Ligand SMILES: *Cc1c(COP(=O)(O)O)cnc(C)c1O
């Protein structure tokens with residue numbers, strides 16, 4: 116078996132200290148326990164596997180893959196490209212942290228640093244230029260249906276099975292939209308009453324009808340509505356503040372032994388609010404995108 | 418289920434690029450995919466669980482636990498103490514990196530920084546002083562039999578089962594001695610011919626009859642022979658150099674998509690040497706103690 120085969124089948128834990136008696140149960144699926152360190156291992160593998168199935172790629176070919184990202188998707192893609200023999204090029208703003216750059220380069224990914232003032236725009240443009248110039252494959256994480264399918268076929272079934280089909284609400288901090296759409300659809304097809312609640316930063320609350328903005332929940336809240344997000348599935352949207360989520364993330368670590376990432380703090384905070392609304396006999400399920408290992412130099416744990 | 422229940426059942430992957438046709442198969446068990454980030458999650462939980470079973474501890478009591486360590490054992494203990502409600506105090510040299518200190522404090526562990534010039538000695542002395550003063554419980558990782566039992570009951574069975582009882586040699590970089598002793602005994606009780614090979618830093622080659630010394634394989638090669646290491650099980654000892662292991666660790670990341678820790682580089686390098694000796698139709702199994710996530714600031718990936 117290769118590393119791609121080590122992706123998935125992550126555990127789900129029930130919170131016991133940060134919750135209160137008047138709350139529904141709160142379960143958290145730990146996606147940080149993936150070989151790539153995050154939930155992105157799933158869509159990264161699925162988008163590449165889907166490309167191989169469609170004949171766009173053939174493993175061990177040295178074919179070029181390009182994607183504008185330096186986040187978890189970049190790490191997941193780098194891991195898979197290293198394992199399956201593809202040349203990966205990732206575009207990203209020049210202001211990227213040395214830490215992240217080191218992880219990506221460790222996997223052999225080639226990095227192209229773009230205009231720091233043009234943020235994501237310059238990164239997207241360079242990726243498109245390379246795709247055109249090299250005839251490369253671009254996963255296109257925000258609109259590739261294979262992203263959603265990864266969660267519809269693995270993440271969803273796993274969560275459903277682990278919780279024995281008993282879930283009253285599913286809460287998630289949306290990024291590409293793949294997870295909430297894939298898991299949400301899978302759950303709603305089986306649980307008539309289940310509620311699917313999206314979580315987004317109050318500082319970049321576009322799903323709530325607000326405006327995009329800079330925020331600290333790395334990995335979620337892209338500032339736009341991605342094609343992979345099926346709004347028709349949503350039963351609500353909860354806005355979260357770092358001021359509330361970071362202290363909670365620290366409590367999770369000190370009280371539950373759960374050392375999670377920045378987005379996890381926001382997601383769990385939201386899950387607690389939903390748990391209080393539903394009450395004692397209910398069950399709220401949510402997912403922790405990644406662990407705290409990559410954020411020791413951030414205000415979350417610094 | 419709580420975080421302690423998320424420990425174990427880690428995957429095993431077969432190397433495909435760094436190996437050669439004239440080598441036996443080389444399988445690597447990824448212990449970095451544990452909630453605490455390393456194989457130490459197992460002995461940490463087992464030593465505490467064993468203490469509860471013997472009546473020394475009762476969870477949720479706020480009882481004090483003290484151990485002289487800032488390594489993976491400290492992280493594993495911190496995680497369990499946070500989850501089960503114990504007050505954890507870890508002693509360590511004052512020259513400890515801020516990164517590690519941040520992880521430990523995230524879990525709520527109390528840190529006592531001791532004389533930087535007295536290395537581990539001052540740390541051990543302060544831990545003993547606290548045990549005495551507070552009547553605290555000290556796991557005592559190098560001599561506690563529960564450490565070994567964790568691997569005899571979980572790590573060993575898992576590896577054996579995953580490889581369908583077909584293992585010709587088991588290779589591991591010894592630290593406390595728990596893993597090689599526990600897994601080694603489990604395997605030798607079932608596989609008559611299996612060879613158990615220990616790995617140690619050439620720079621601190623005490624098992625080979627050499628002398629202790631400073632080295633870069635964090636987590637292994639303590640510079641002494643621990644009580645938990647059963648020398649009678651060993652069929653050999655392989656000395657490894659960072660000069661050889663670090664480049665290999667980088668190849669594993671770029672070619673196998675396996676981003677592993679410093680000790681993993683030394684262990685896999687040794688496993689390759691054994692694989693070449695055994696040949697094509699054989700199987701060599703080894704374990705990766707942790708991932709590369711904690712070593713981005715080291716010469717391995719910096
Ligand atoms: C990818 C990611 C998310 C969002 O998951 P999507 O399926 O992309 O919606 C949230 N947090 C982190 C840290 C992520 O990497």
Ligand SMILES: *Cc1c(COP(=O)(O)O)cnc(C)c1O
Nearest residue numbers: 489592593594595596636680706
């Ligand atoms: C604990 C550890 C080891 C050694 O395992 P033992 O069972 O203690 O022999 C090796 N490498 C790392 C990184 C470790 O944390």
Ligand SMILES: CC(C)CCC(=O)O
Nearest residue numbers: 184186187188290291
């Ligand atoms: C989900 C998005 C906000 C970020 C994807 C990434 O580059 O990891």
Ligand SMILES: CC(C)CCC(=O)O
Nearest residue numbers: 486488489490592593
């Ligand atoms: C195995 C030993 C060399 C180190 C144990 C630790 O403190 O993590």
